[PDB]
RNA sequence: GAAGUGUGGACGCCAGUCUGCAUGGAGCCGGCCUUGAAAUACCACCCUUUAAUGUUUGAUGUUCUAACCCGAAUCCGGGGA
């Protein structure tokens, strides 16, 4: 396989450095397109706690202003507020079925309280993607046509699901070496940081640079 | 972390790919990637179960063996956990 080549370059055994990562990173991203890198780490916190979960943002190294695709979802006559915002996009809890068969087109969005538990519900698209609202990050509330004003003013959220680790894009391929590296120590900074308090043990169990497909390398966070 | 392929095998009973095996045609990765009766890519949740192996451990049945009981002066014999 085609892996056979990628592999040769790269040893699950050894336990390359981030500088070293990006470089060897590169090579293994031989494809179409620009491929999108990223960064999966072991968390060793209680999962079902919510103490436990880890959320929050990173400045990482560009796309805010008029440009930014905004889409809210509101209800009666929350969605009126929303179309004299200045939204391109509008609806009720019905564009929840187009969004499922595959329309993504937009950046951002945003959504009253009242339609939090039906896209709740269907979060496990837009939540690693990080597109799922949410209160702190100023994305849910009743007054929608401010925050669709207050948007276009500029973060890479991260979360956890259902299935292991956590992770986030860190950037593209075609990214030199010294930019990317500069990411991902920049990303790991951000989590240690939003390690809770309860959590014993290993924050980081195991650290893996990764794009979204290209021989998994593990690396130290250190 | 060579198996994928198209006709090739196993240790507890049923299928998708993995390794030191052996090779051709099936194309180099790929298979993969728009057929009704044979159909899609990424990091906690009912499985998270089941199946197998090693260590610790609970109950039952068998054999053997030191306690105990009886016979005998003793040796020892009979019975027997």
Redesign the pocket.
């Known amino acids: 396989?085609?892996?056979?080549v990628?592999?040769e370059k790269?040893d699950?055994t050894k336990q390359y450095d981030i500088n070293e990562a990006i470089a060897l990173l590169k090579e293994l991203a031989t494809?179409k397109f620009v491929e999108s890198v990223?960064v999966?780490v072991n968390l060793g916190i209680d999962?079902?706690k919510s103490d436990?979960?880890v959320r929050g943002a990173t400045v990482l190294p560009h796309g805010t202003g008029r440009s930014v695709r905004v889409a809210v979802f509101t209800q009666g006559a929350n969605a009126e507020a929303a179309k004299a915002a200045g939204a391109e996009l509008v609806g009720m809890e019905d564009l929840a079925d187009q969004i499922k068969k595959?329309e993504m087109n937009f950046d951002v969005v945003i959504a009253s309280p009242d339609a939090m538990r039906v896209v709740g519900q269907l979060g496990?698209?837009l939540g690693?993607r990080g597109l799922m609202p949410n209160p702190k990050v100023g994305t849910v509330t009743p007054n929608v046509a401010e925050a669709v004003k207050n948007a276009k003013a500029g973060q890479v959220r991260?979360?956890?699901?259902?299935?292991?680790?956590?992770?986030?894009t860190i950037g593209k391929v075609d990214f030199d070496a010294d930019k990317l590296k500069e990411n991902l120590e920049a990303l790991l900074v951000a989590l240690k940081k939003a390690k809770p308090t309860q959590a014993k043990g290993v924050y980081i169990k195991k650290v893996s640079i990764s794009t979204?497909?290209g021989?998994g390398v593990a690396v130290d966070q250190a």
């Open positions: 396989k085609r892996m056979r990628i592999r790269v699950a494809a990223d999966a999962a079902r436990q979960n595959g496990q698209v690693p991260y979360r956890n699901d259902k299935n292991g680790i956590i992770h986030t979204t497909m021989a």
